[PDB]
Amino acid sequence: STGSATTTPIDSLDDAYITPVQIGTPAQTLNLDFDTGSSDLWVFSSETTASEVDGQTIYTPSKSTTAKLLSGATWSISYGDGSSSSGDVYTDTVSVGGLTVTGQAVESAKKVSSSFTEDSTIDGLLGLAFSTLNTVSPTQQKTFFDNAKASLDSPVFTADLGYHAPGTYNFGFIDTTAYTGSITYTAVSTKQGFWEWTSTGYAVGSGTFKSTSIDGIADTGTTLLYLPATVVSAYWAQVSGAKSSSSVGGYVFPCSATLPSFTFGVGSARIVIPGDYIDFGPISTGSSSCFGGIQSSAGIGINIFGDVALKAAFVVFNGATTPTLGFASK
Structure with missing residues (x-):
């Protein structure tokens, strides 16, 4: 299998890039920041403290027929820029550019720091570093790429980011x-x-x-x-x-x-x-x-x-x- 998705700068400076991701059944499309420096896929959700949501599209697991609560699991992450977020954990079907992973850990935010709230364009992160960095406890979870890997035509993904323009993330082929x-x-x-x-x-x-x-x-x-x-x-x-x-x-x-x-x-x-x-x-x-x-x-x-x-x-x-x-x- 393969996938191909367009990634788009959030603003005129290319401060970050967002890529549409389908989560759940029926699909809920959220725009995620693909991050090769972290290993958690987390989203704004129906569980996120209301006062900490400001324009983001949220994931609502109760509306997904394929969502499963990972019993007792929690997550909590701090990024290099000082931002952070935390919550509980579901698994659900996640698709990127036509590539589908079933049973992907989707980390639902209960709390997010101000920098996330203040960025209305980013609905969450999709981590693409190694799964050893994943913050789910008590049992660490695999990244979208790690889960997809064995099914891909080739065990690769590519980043082709644009300068003041859209670009592409491909999975499984060059x-x-x-x-x-x-x-x-x-x-x-x-x-x-x-x-x-x-x-x-x-x-x-x-x-x-x-x-x-x-x-x-x-x-x-x-x-x-x-x-x-x-x-x-x-x-x-x-x-x-x-x-x-x-x-x-x-x-x-x-x-x-x-x-x-x-x-x-x-x-x-x-x-x-x-x-x-x-x-x-x-x-x-x-x-x-x-x-x-x-x-x-x-x-x-x-x-x-x-x-x-x-x-x-x-x-x-x-x-x-x-x-x-x-x-x-x-």
């Missing part, structure tokens, strides 16, 4: 028309539960590529590119007027600047992020100061190849017995 040149594959460590890999270096604009190992995670659920302070300082030093602002929370630059591209290495191959992808617009409405899309990972504890990086590539998440990641230009 669309050879969706990229230019060849896909370069690179080793993955699952030791921390993430799609963790080692980039072979970077370049700033037209500068010569610096060969240096950068361990990080491929994370579709993170907006920006977070890299070591050395790398990030080298980038912003090439932007006139750029500076790090502790009050704003990172590097800012004059909105009128021309941003250089940023290149990261994948083995001997190279992915070039155009300068425009690094512009996240005014720091506040009407400001002439803009927020940068490449920021320091110091204090996160891990480097993160988030949407800024991933949307410059066609990315293969290969879930074969020995997992790998593939990157191609597009």
Whole structure:
């Protein structure tokens, strides 16, 4: 089997992407944030504290003939950005782009933090990291991909995120028309539960590529590119007027600047992020100061190849017995 679904930016900055997901019988369609950096599929629901729901579409398990309550099970998650959510657990039929998993754990939120409430466009998350990170207790549950894997034509999914445009998540096949040149594959460590890999270096604009190992995670659920302070300082030093602002929370630059591209290495191959992808617009409405899309990972504890990086590539998440990641230009 295979599936193919379009993913769409939630706003004009590509802050996140939403993908329609069918849950239950008859189908209830919710727009979920596919997140390769976490492993819980959770939704706003009829159980979510009413005061914490503000515009989201909710899952109502009592209206699904295939919903089953997982007796006694709970879940609770905290994300890198400080947001969180928690609740109880159902299983139900879940379909993405024509691909159906029966008995998928659908984690129903009883509580969500303010950042979730305040984002009316995101109805929940669909985790695509390794199932070892799943937060269901007392017994951990499998991700949608882990459940689908054995049925897929090939044990893979691909992320093809758009810049200020829709893109595609495919399951079970590689669309050879969706990229230019060849896909370069690179080793993955699952030791921390993430799609963790080692980039072979970077370049700033037209500068010569610096060969240096950068361990990080491929994370579709993170907006920006977070890299070591050395790398990030080298980038912003090439932007006139750029500076790090502790009050704003990172590097800012004059909105009128021309941003250089940023290149990261994948083995001997190279992915070039155009300068425009690094512009996240005014720091506040009407400001002439803009927020940068490449920021320091110091204090996160891990480097993160988030949407800024991933949307410059066609990315293969290969879930074969020995997992790998593939990157191609597009």
